[PDB]
Amino acid sequence: LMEAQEWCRKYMKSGNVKDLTQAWDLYYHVFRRISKQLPQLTSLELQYVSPKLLMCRDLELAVPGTYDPNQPIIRIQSIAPSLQVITSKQRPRKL
Amino acid sequence: FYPAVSMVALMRIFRDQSLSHHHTMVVQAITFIFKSLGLKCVQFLPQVMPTFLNVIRVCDGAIREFLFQQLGMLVSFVKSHIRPYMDEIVTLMR
């Protein structure tokens, strides 16, 4: 990606398509690789993605869309250690 | 289907007041069910076992020597899958 950025930036001083073909080589390269990765990212181990939330225990901050002025606060005791991922267009998490 | 229905009816009795007479009968059925199923019996464990162990502590000693005979029978069919409830069992034995 650094190298494809270099070539697309060498376009902005020269303006040749011969720069751009070298960049789209590497771009399509990672595109195809990453396209072959995302189908199997079915669950996200929370340590790998966001350590602060794994570390998080017992926030005073309330569980989102629970707060009632007439109830006592049901507060975030702890976030779950791993996240199920729904497969759609937008790959939502089931946090 | 069939084992699941019977198990639910049996366990609906298996709660103090009706069992005053019909403990023994229920437990004889269960033990026969698990004996018959193989290892597919394992699915009913969390339904049966918590009530079962509480029955032993609650009931009279007239029955109690029998319940342990049948507990040991459940144990044998289930084998290693009983491990979650083992603390309670050992507490009961102790």
């Binding site: 669950s43 181990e45 | 290892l39 597919k40 394992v42 290693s80 491990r83 979650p84």
Partner: protein, 50 residues
């Protein structure tokens, strides 16, 4: 009179190559062993199910 000194390993074998046949149809428990809920799911220091 020096002894029949048999300390050599003139039989110097060498392991050249390795097959890692590895039947491990992941997420498909074969009909023999019905596995536990918290079973041993590690497998060369990886949870395959994750």
């Amino acid at each position: 009179k020096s002894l029949a000194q048999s300390w050599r390993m003139k039989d110097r074998m060498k392991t050249v190559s390795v097959a890692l046949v590895l039947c491990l149809n992941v997420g498909v428990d074969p009909p023999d062993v019905v596995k536990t809920t918290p079973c041993a799911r590690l497998e060369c220091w990886i949870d395959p199910l994750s």
